[PDB]
Unconditional design. Structure first.
Ligand SMILES: *[C@@H]1O[C@H](CO)[C@@H](O)[C@H](O)[C@H]1NC(C)=O
Ligand SMILES: *[C@@H]1O[C@H](CO)[C@@H](O)[C@H](O)[C@H]1NC(C)=O
Lengths: 215, 215, 322, 324, 215, 215
C-alpha cells in the first residue's frame, strides 16, 4: 500500500554532511509519519525521530538532536534527513519507515534502506571474473563469479534475471571489497545453454555482465 | 529509557517445532488498558516486517502460526509450527514512552537433517593471471550443520596463509549453509606449483571430501 | 517595569512603564531556575519530617521537582555528615502532580521525591506545598513555608487584561480568554498540572462564578473566574490531564468532524481520536456543546472534551482518560 | 505584545512576548485621542435626542470632553447644512464627571458638559453612549461609535489590569491604582486625571469576590474597582473625598508639615478637610479614631487633603476648607 | 512675622538677563509659596507665578512662561527669578510676596520690591546741592536739597534720620533724573542747630551728606 | 482669566465721609462656600497691605472703619469714616482660579479746606555756578487743591524754557500737596540777568503770591 522509496548509497568524507531522502506514496494527512532508524551491520536499531511531510510535526530523540536534521517537502511528500559532522560511528544503514505518534500503531511499511559509508576512500568499480570448471561431470554443474576490488559496498549479482543461487558476503582486503556468487544448474543445460552473471555496483555506476564459457 | 532485553540471544529450532522468544521491559509499556509492544521479523538485507502489533494481535496477512502474549513488563512471541521461511532475526519494540526502544534481537536458526557439502574447485581466471595476481577459489555448497573447517593442499603441502572464508545466511528453502574459501597469491606463486587440492572435513563423514585439479 | 513593546496583531509599538506579564511557558530555554536559600535548612526540615513519619514529598510545580533533581546529592550528603541513615532519591513526574496531605516545618531509611505512586509510601505520608519564594537565566530563591494550605504560591502567579484579551499566567500555566461577541476562554497551555487552588487574589472576574462551569477545574489550579468559561461546556473533570503537558484550544482534531445532535451520548471521560492500534475515528458529536469543539493535544495525539463522543464508533474500542 | 523592559526596582532586564499595561496617566504627552468614525451619525443622534427632550450630554471620560471640543465646529456646521436651528456648545470639566439619566441612540441650545444648570439638569442629559471601534497608530487614535445598549459601566476596551511580583495595578485612560502585599494586601497609590461616575466592570477586576462596597477605598460609584485590592485596614469608603479636585494623587503618607495621632478623643469621620485654611494658615496637629498609619492623603492643585477619618486635633473644623 | 528680603536694584542692557532673589525668614514648609508680581510704575500688577523653596513646587502664568524662570535654594530658603531676553516692557518693580496655593489664602506679607531698569544708560551718581534762604523770617523755616543728574532711579533722602518732610518724585531730563526734598523746622532752631540731608543712591553705591548753612 | 474691573478709577472724598469702591469680576470668584476676594491698600513707595481677606473678614490689626461685602461677581469696599492716613491706592484681587488677577486700582484723594502755598525761592548754589551750569529753584509747599500753575519772571520777562515741575503725593498728615519748579540754564545765562521772581496763582487768591530776589 504505502510505498517508501529511499535515496541511493552514499560515500562521504569525514566531518562532512549527507542529506538522504524518502518519498512516500499512498499516504494520508492523518498517518504518514516518516520515522528514521540507524542500524550498524548486524547490531541493534537506534530510533532517531519522525517527521510528517504534511503536518511538519517533527520529533527527535535525545541521542541525535545535535546530529540529525529533519526537513520535508509537501508536494513531493518527501522526508529529508541530514547528519551534521560525520564520523566512522555513522557508517551504517539508515532505514525510513512509516509509523505514527507516540502510543499509536507500529512500523507498518519500510523503505529499502540507505547505506552510508564515511571514509576518504575513492569509489573504485569492481573486476568481474568468471568461474567455470575438463574434469568429472554429474547431473548438475555449478558456476560462479568473483567480484574483486571494489569500494564501497555493495554490489548486486543476478543470474539471467531468474534455479538455485547463493550469494556470499563481501570481505575487506587492503581497503577494497571481494565477494563471490555461485549458481547451480543441470549439466545437460550447460554449456549447451548460455548463462550470464550480472554484477551491478551503483556507487561507481558500473554494470558488468560476464558470459560463462568453459576453460 | 525503557530498555527491552530479549531472550535468548540466538535460538536453534527444528522444523515443525514450537519457538518461544521473550521480551523483558525495564518499565511498564501498558497505558490506557493496552500494551504498546510489537514483534518484527527481519530477513537479512531487507527491511523488518511486522508480525504482532500490540501484545496479541496478528498483523494482517501474517500466518496464524505467529502469536503474542504478555503484559506490563513480560511478553512472549510464539511460532508454531516454525517453518523454513522463518530463518531471520526477531525484534521487540515499545512505543509507550519516548524514546522508542528496540530489543537486542533474537537470531533464529533452523535445525534439519545433516547433509554433506558439495565441493567445487576453480583455478584462477585467464583475465586474472594477466593482471598480476592469482586467486584459487573453492565453493562449499549446501551443507549442515554450519560448523566446518576447510583445508587447502598445494602440491601436498598444507596452506594456511592468505585464506579468506565467508559464510552465507541459512537458505530459506532447504535450511542449509554455504561457504567460499579464497586463496589469494601473487601471479608468479601460482605457477611454481602444479597440483591444487581442496579438502573439507564435516560432521557427515570422518574421511574428508576432496576435490583437486592440475595444470 | 519600564521599556518598549511591539504588538504584531494590533500593529503598534508602545513604550512606557508598568507591568509586563510574560509567557514563561513557550520559552525555548529555561528562563527561571529554582534554588534553595539554605540547603542545610532543607536537610533539617527533611530530618524533622522523617521523624514525624513522612516517607517522602510530592512537588507542587515542575520547577520544584527539577530543583529536587539538581539538589538531591547535597541533601543526601548533608544528611550523611550528620549521620542519619536516610537516602533521598528523586524520580520523574507522572501526569498530574498529585497532592500530599503532610507538610514540612521551618527552622536503611529512604525518602522518595516524586516518581510514581506506591502503597508502601502513599500520598497520606508525603509532604506537599511547603515552599514559598523569598527573593530573586534568572534565579529564584526558595525558603521553608509557615502555614499548611492548599493554595499555589501567590508570588509566582500573575494575571492581566487589556484590549479585551485576558491572561492568567504562572510558571507552568498560560490561560488566554478573549472578547469575541462574548467573554470566553480561548487557549490554554500546560507544561505541568498541579493540584493546588488558584488564589482569587490573582484572579480576574472572580465573582458570580459557578465552579461547575469553570472549564479548567478548580481542583487543578483553575482560576475561579468567568474568564474560565466556554458556552456549552462544563467542568473538564476527566480531561486528559494525565498527559502532564498539553495544549487545549477550540478547533477540530485533524481528520475529524464534530456535529451537534441530541442523539449523541452523554459527557464522559475524554477520548482521543486515534485508537491504540492507530485507526482514526472520523465522526464525532456532542449533545449541547458549541463549536469549535474543545480539543486537547498532547504527546500522544489529539483528544476531545468530555462532551465530545464518537458518532458511530463504539466507545469500548477507543482510548479514554481514566 | 513583544519587546523588552527594564525594571529599576527589580534591577533586571526582560525581553519576550505577552501583555504590557502602560501607565497612561503619568504620560508626558497625549498618547491617545478620541475621534468619531462618523460625525454625521453623531449629528443625527443629537437631532433625535434634542427632539425627544434631551437638552444636553455629560461626558464619562475626559478624553470624550476633549473630543467634543475638537468636534463641535463640524457638528454645528453639519447641523446648519441639515436645516435645523439647534446650536451645540460644549464647556469645560468640573471635578467629578457627573452622570446623566438619558442617552443617545444609533433660539434652541444644546449644552455639553460645562457647569451645573437648572435649565438643563442631568436628568435630561445623555451619558455613556459611546464605545470604542478600533485603533489608530503612530500619539494614537481611538475611534468611537454610538453604543447599542445603555448601561452604567465604563467602556471596557479602555480598561486594563495586571498583577506581578505581588504588585497589582488597575489602570485606565484616566486612572492608575497600585496595590501591594506588605504583610497584607492593601491599596498603596492612586492617580487620577479624571473622576468619573461609571462602574468599573468586574471582567477587568482582580480579586472581585467577597468584596464589601463599604470597605472599598475608592467608591464603587466613582469607577472604583470592586476588589479586595481596594482595601486599606482602618479606612472605609471615601464617599466624601476631595473628588471635586478632578485631578489628584492619593497615597499613604503625612501631609507636609503635619502629624496625625490615633486617639479615642478624636472626632468621628466626616467629609475630607484640607491642611490649609482658606486664609492659608496650616493646621499642624491631626488625629483619627481607629485608622491605621501612615495616613490616607490626597494631593491636588490646591494642596494636601486627608482621609475622611482624619480630623483636626485642636483646631475647630469651621475655619477649615472641606469637600462638600 | 514672615520677613521677606529682596535683592537690590538692577540696571541691565537690552537682550541680557537678570536674576533677582528673595529670602524668607519665619517660614514653614507647608506655607511659604513665594509669588512674584510685575508692576510698571502706577500700572496694574501682573501675576508671574510662585515657587516653594522646600517643595520646589513651581507654577507659572501663561504670559511669563517663556520670560521668567523660578529656582530655589532650600538651605538659604530663597527664591530666584530670571527674566530671559530683556526689553523696555520689562523695566518695572518686581515684588516678592508670601502666598499659598490656588484656593488658599491671600498675599499676607510682601517684600520691599526690586526695581529693574533695562537701558544702555550707565550708572551715574547724583550731585547734591543744599538749599537755604538774608530775607524775611517767621516762626518756621523750610530747607531743601536738590539731587540732580543720576541714573538709575532711585535715591533715598533722609533728614537727620528722624518734623515735617516732603519728598518729590524724580523727573527725567536729558536721560538723567532730577529730584528734590524739602523739610520744615522752627526758625528758632535754625541755623543755631545743625541740619544735614543724606542722599543714598544704591545702584552707584554712593551716599552724600550735605550740611545746611545759610548763604 | 478672571478680570477684575474697579470703579471708580480715582476717587476724591472729604475727611469723615463714606468711601465706596466696587470690584466687578468677569467670572464667579466663589468656591467652597467662600468668596476668594481680597482688598489691599498701597501707600506710594511701599508694598501693599491687606485690609479685607475673603469677602468680609477684617484683617488683624486693621482699623474697624474698613469693611468688605459682596459675592459672586460684585464686591464693595467701604471706608467710614475715611481719615487723613487713607490717602493711598486700593486694589482688589482674586485667587479662585489661575492666574491670580488684580483690579486696575482706585486712587483715593482726600478733600480738605483749601490752603495757600508757602513759596520759597532759591538761587543757584556756589558749587553749581563753578561746574558750568545754573539752576534756580522754587518750592511751593502745603497747598490745596492740587491744580496750580506757576510763573517765572526773569528781569520782568516771563520765562517758559527749560522749566520742569514735580508734584508730590498728598501728605498723610495735613492732606496737602507740594510742587518743585526748576529753571535750568547754563551758568553764563544766569549772570546776564539780575532779578528773579517766582509767582503762583492759586484758588486761594486772585492776586498771585510772589517771591523774588536779586544778585
Ligand atoms: C468570532 O465569532 C464569530 C461568530 O461566531 C466567528 O465567525 C469568528 O470566527 C470569531 N472570531 C474569532 C474567534 O477570532
Ligand atoms: C511595610 O510595612 C512596614 C511597617 O513598619 C514599613 O515600615 C515598610 O516601609 C513597608 N514597606 C513597603 C514597601 O510598603
Amino acid at each position: 500500500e504505502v510505498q517508501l522509496q529511499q535515496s541511493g548509497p552514499e560515500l562521504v568524507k569525514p566531518g562532512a554532511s549527507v542529506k538522504m531522502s524518502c518519498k512516500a506514496s499512498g499516504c494520508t494527512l492523518t498517518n504518514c509519519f516518516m520515522h528514521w532508524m540507524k542500524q550498524k551491520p548486524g547490531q541493534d536499531l537506534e530510533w532517531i525521530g519522525y517527521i510528517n511531510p504534511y503536518n511538519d510535526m517533527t520529533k527527535y530523540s535525545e541521542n541525535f538532536k545535535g546530529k540529525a536534521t529533519l526537513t520535508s517537502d509537501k508536494s513531493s511528500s518527501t522526508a529529508f534527513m541530514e547528519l551534521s559532522s560525520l564520523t566512522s560511528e555513522d557508517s551504517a544503514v539508515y532505514y525510513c519507515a512509516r509509523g505514527y505518534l507516540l502510543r499509536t500503531g507500529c512500523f507498518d511499511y519500510w523503505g529499502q534502506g540507505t547505506t552510508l559509508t564515511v571514509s576518504s576512500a575513492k569509489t573504485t568499480p569492481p573486476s568481474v571474473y568468471p568461474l567455470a570448471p575438463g574434469d568429472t561431470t554429474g547431473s548438475s554443474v555449478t558456476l560462479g563469479c568473483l567480484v574483486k576490488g571494489y569500494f564501497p559496498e555493495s554490489v548486486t549479482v543476478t543470474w539471467n534475471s531468474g534455479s538455485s543461487v547463493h550469494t556470499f558476503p563481501a570481505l575487506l582486503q587492503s581497503g577494497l571489497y571481494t565477494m563471490s556468487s555461485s549458481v547451480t544448474v543441470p549439466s545437460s543445460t550447460w554449456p549447451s545453454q548460455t548463462v550470464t552473471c550480472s554484477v551491478a555496483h551503483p556507487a561507481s555506476s558500473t554494470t558488468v555482465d560476464k558470459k560463462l564459457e568453459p576453460s | 529509557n525503557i530498555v527491552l532485553t530479549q531472550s535468548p540471544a540466538s535460538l536453534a529450532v527444528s522444523l515443525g517445532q514450537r519457538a518461544t522468544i521473550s521480551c523483558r521491559a525495564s518499565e511498564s509499556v501498558d497505558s490506557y488498558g493496552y500494551s504498546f509492544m510489537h514483534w518484527y521479523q527481519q530477513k537479512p538485507g531487507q527491511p523488518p516486517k511486522v508480525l504482532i502489533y500490540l501484545a496479541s494481535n496478528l498483523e494482517s496477512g501474517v500466518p496464524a502460526r505467529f502469536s503474542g502474549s504478555g503484559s506490563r513488563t513480560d511478553f512472549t512471541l510464539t511460532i508454531d509450527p516454525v517453518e523454513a521461511d522463518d530463518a531471520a532475526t526477531y525484534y521487540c519494540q515499545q512505543n509507550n514512552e519516548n524514546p522508542l526502544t528496540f530489543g537486542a534481537g533474537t537470531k533464529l536458526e533452523l535445525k534439519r537433517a545433516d547433509a554433506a557439502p558439495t565441493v567445487s574447485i576453480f583455478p584462477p581466471s585467464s583475465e586474472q593471471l594477466t593482471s598480476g595476481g592469482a586467486s584459487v577459489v573453492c565453493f562449499l555448497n549446501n551443507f549442515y550443520p554450519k560448523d566446518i573447517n576447510v583445508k587447502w593442499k598445494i602440491d601436498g603441502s598444507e596452506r594456511q596463509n592468505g585464506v579468506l572464508n565467508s559464510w552465507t545466511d541459512q537458505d530459506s528453502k532447504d535450511s542449509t549453509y554455504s561457504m567460499s574459501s579464497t586463496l589469494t597469491l601473487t601471479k608468479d606463486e601460482y605457477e611454481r606449483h602444479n597440483s591444487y587440492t581442496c579438502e573439507a572435513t564435516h560432521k557427515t563423514s570422518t574421511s574428508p571430501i576432496v576435490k583437486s585439479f592440475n595444470r | 517595569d519600564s521599556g518598549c513593546v511591539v504588538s504584531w496583531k494590533n500593529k503598534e509599538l508602545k513604550c512606557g512603564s508598568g507591568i509586563f506579564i510574560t509567557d514563561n511557558v513557550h520559552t525555548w530555554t529555561e528562563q527561571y531556575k529554582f534554588q534553595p536559600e539554605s540547603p542545610s535548612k532543607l536537610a533539617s526540615a527533611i530530618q524533622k519530617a522523617h521523624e514525624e513519619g513522612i516517607c517522602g514529598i510530592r512537588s507542587v510545580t515542575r520547577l520544584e521537582n527539577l530543583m529536587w533533581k539538581q539538589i538531591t546529592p547535597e541533601l543526601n550528603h548533608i544528611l550523611s555528615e550528620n549521620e542519619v541513615k536516610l537516602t533521598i532519591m528523586t524520580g520523574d513526574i507522572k501526569g498530574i502532580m498529585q497532592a500530599g496531605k503532610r507538610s514540612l516545618r521551618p527552622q536503611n531509611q529512604t525518602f522518595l521525591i516524586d516518581g510514581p505512586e506506591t502503597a508502601e509510601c502513599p500520598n497520606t505520608n508525603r509532604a506537599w506545598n511547603s515552599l514559598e519564594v523569598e527573593d530573586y537565566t534568572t534565579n529564584i530563591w526558595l525558603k521553608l513555608k509557615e502555614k499548611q494550605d492548599v493554595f499555589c504560591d501567590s508570588k509566582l502567579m500573575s494575571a492581566a487584561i487589556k484590549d479585551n484579551r485576558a491572561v492568567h499566567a504562572d510558571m507552568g500555566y498560560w490561560i488566554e480568554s478573549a472578547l469575541n461577541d462574548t467573554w470566553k476562554i480561548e487557549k490554554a497551555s500546560f507544561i505541568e498540572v498541579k493540584n493546588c487552588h488558584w488564589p482569587k487574589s490573582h484572579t480576574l472576574w472572580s465573582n458570580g462564578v459557578l465552579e461547575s462551569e469553570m472549564i479548567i477545574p478548580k481542583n487543578l489550579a483553575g482560576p475561579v473566574s468567568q474568564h474560565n468559561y466556554r458556552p456549552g461546556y462544563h467542568t473538564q473533570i476527566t480531561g486528559p490531564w494525565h498527559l502532564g503537558k498539553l495544549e487545549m484550544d477550540f478547533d477540530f482534531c485533524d481528520g475529524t468532524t464534530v456535529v451537534v445532535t441530541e442523539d449523541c451520548g452523554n459527557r464522559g471521560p475524554s477520548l482521543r481520536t486515534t485508537t491504540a492500534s492507530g485507526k482514526l475515528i472520523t465522526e464525532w458529536c456532542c449533545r449541547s456543546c458549541t463549536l469549535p469543539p474543545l480539543r486537547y493535544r498532547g504527546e500522544d495525539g489529539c483528544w476531545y472534551g468530555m462532551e465530545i463522543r464518537p458518532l458511530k464508533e463504539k466507545e469500548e474500542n477507543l482510548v479514554n482518560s481514566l
